[PDB]
Structure 1
Amino acid sequence: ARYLGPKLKLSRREGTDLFLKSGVRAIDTKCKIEQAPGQHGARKPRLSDYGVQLREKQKVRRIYGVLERQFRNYYKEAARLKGNTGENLLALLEGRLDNVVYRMGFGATRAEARQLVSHKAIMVNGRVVNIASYQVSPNDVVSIREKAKKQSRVKAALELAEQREKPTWLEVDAGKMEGTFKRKPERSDLSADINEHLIVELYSK
């Protein structure tokens, strides 16, 4: 119900930084990012069209930290919602509270953000929410609880998020330790490395 195994193995299999470590240290310094995991990982075999589709799907899942059943449901919703399914899918994932908590810079990773949420340290509009998959809406104020404002990991996580590219669709306050989910992110606001149409095709099988 969560992936609790080694993180960099996942990054190595996708062949990209999935941001599953804090990013105080470079990913190449902690692992061989170029090399896929295991004995036969130095080999780079030719990947099928299905394999390209799969590995794109698993990349997005592994970033956000979503198991297949819940991800398939996010796809069904995106297909249902009007407009571009691919863009809708990425919007839903970005909506998730664990993600939003991470992007604001309260958790160092999405897993640390997920723990904060799960451990009743986050409030949405003044009310405690401990569900990682909780969809945050525009004009919602995510905040740290007064008990959790002293947590040393939260102080550290803010300093990391200062290094990263700041989300334009959020607006955080570091002293308050609250932020406003201003709007839903556009497709332009998210990274161009994701080929979401491969996921759309994968599920259209």
Structure 2
Amino acid sequence: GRYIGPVCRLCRREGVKLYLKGERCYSPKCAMERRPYPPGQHGQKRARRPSDYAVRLREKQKLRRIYGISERQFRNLFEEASKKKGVTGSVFLGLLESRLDNVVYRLGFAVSRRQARQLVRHGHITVNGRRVDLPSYRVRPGDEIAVAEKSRNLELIRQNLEAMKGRKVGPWLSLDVEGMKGKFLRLPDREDLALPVNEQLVIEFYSR
């Protein structure tokens, strides 16, 4: 099950600030903001030079903890992107991004991905009509990801759908704050995702 537990901890360790919390992570306290360094007892000590391995494992975890997903699924998705025709680097991200529980986060119906998931799970979401509750569900090109109706008027939805009025949503997504809808225009592109992750390393991770 989707990890669970101290996250603004991973925020640390990886040393590259993460928005695993959404709102808070922005305030002067993504944790990494106050104590920017690997947890544990040692944490704040002269870090030995990373091994060729350590590096790639670390970059993989980084990318995986972003989308908060089990190592199993992460790998399958990887192995899938590989055999797929196209630059595996981009493709991998391609599907990673198609995760419904993620398209929810992106479209703004959720502050964190952790949240976006619970929403998707509790059928508060819909796909071109019928509602879906499988985080893993993968969005195709030209779909409407709306908030169900029983949902529409629920504190959370609003507030979140509120900070929206103004802010823009990725070039591969069109959102209608009102109708609380949202289309998955085209498949996200390489740069469109300003991730602090280098795929080429993660790729090389699964090469060993």
Q: Using structure 1 for the length normalisation, give the TM-score.
A: 0.93
- Alpha-carbon distance in structure 1 between the residues aligned to 2:65 and 2:57: 12
- Alpha-carbon distance in structure 1 between the residues aligned to 2:206 and 2:92: 12
Structure 1 residue 192, shift from structure 2 partner: 5.1
Q: Show the 5 A alignment for 1:163-174.
A: 166-174=169-177
Classify 1:104/1:56 alpha carbon distance in 2 versus 1 (closer, same or farther; 3 Å): same
Contact 1:27 1:33 in 2 (8 A): no
Q: 1:34 aligns with which of 29, 33, 36?
A: 36
Cα shift readout 1:122-163 (whole Å, capped 9, x = no counterpart): 111101110001000110100001111112112222344568
1:62 pairs with 2:60: no
Flag the structure with more relative contact order, 1 or 2, with Cα contacts below 8 A and sequence separation at least 6: 1
- Alpha-carbon distance in structure 2 between the residues aligned to 1:37 and 1:97: 31
Segments of structure 1 that go 5 or more residues without pairing to the other structure are none
Q: Using structure 2 for the length normalisation, give the TM-score.
A: 0.92
Contact 2:16 2:196 in 1 (8 A): no
1:94 pairs with 2:101: no
Cα shift readout 1:40-91 (whole Å, capped 9, x = no counterpart): 1112412212111011110111111111010000011100111111111101
Q: Work out the percentage of aligned pairs sharing the same amino acid.
A: 48
Of stretches 114-123 and 145-154 in structure 1, the one that deviates more from structure 2 is 145-154
Contact 2:161 2:180 in 1 (8 A): no
Relative to total residues, which structure has the larger strand share, 1 or 2? 1
Relative to total residues, which structure has the larger helix share, 1 or 2? 1
Q: Show the 5 A alignment for 1:170-181.
A: 170-181=173-184
1:7 corresponds in structure 2 to: 7
Corresponding residue SS for 1:13: coil
Of stretches 73-82 and 23-32 in structure 1, the one that deviates more from structure 2 is 23-32
2:197 corresponds in structure 1 to: 194
Contact 1:108 1:153 in 2 (8 A): no
Q: 1:82 aligns with which of 80, 85, 94?
A: 85
Classify 1:161/1:197 alpha carbon distance in 2 versus 1 (closer, same or farther; 3 Å): farther
- Cα RMSD of the aligned pairs, angstroms, is 1.7
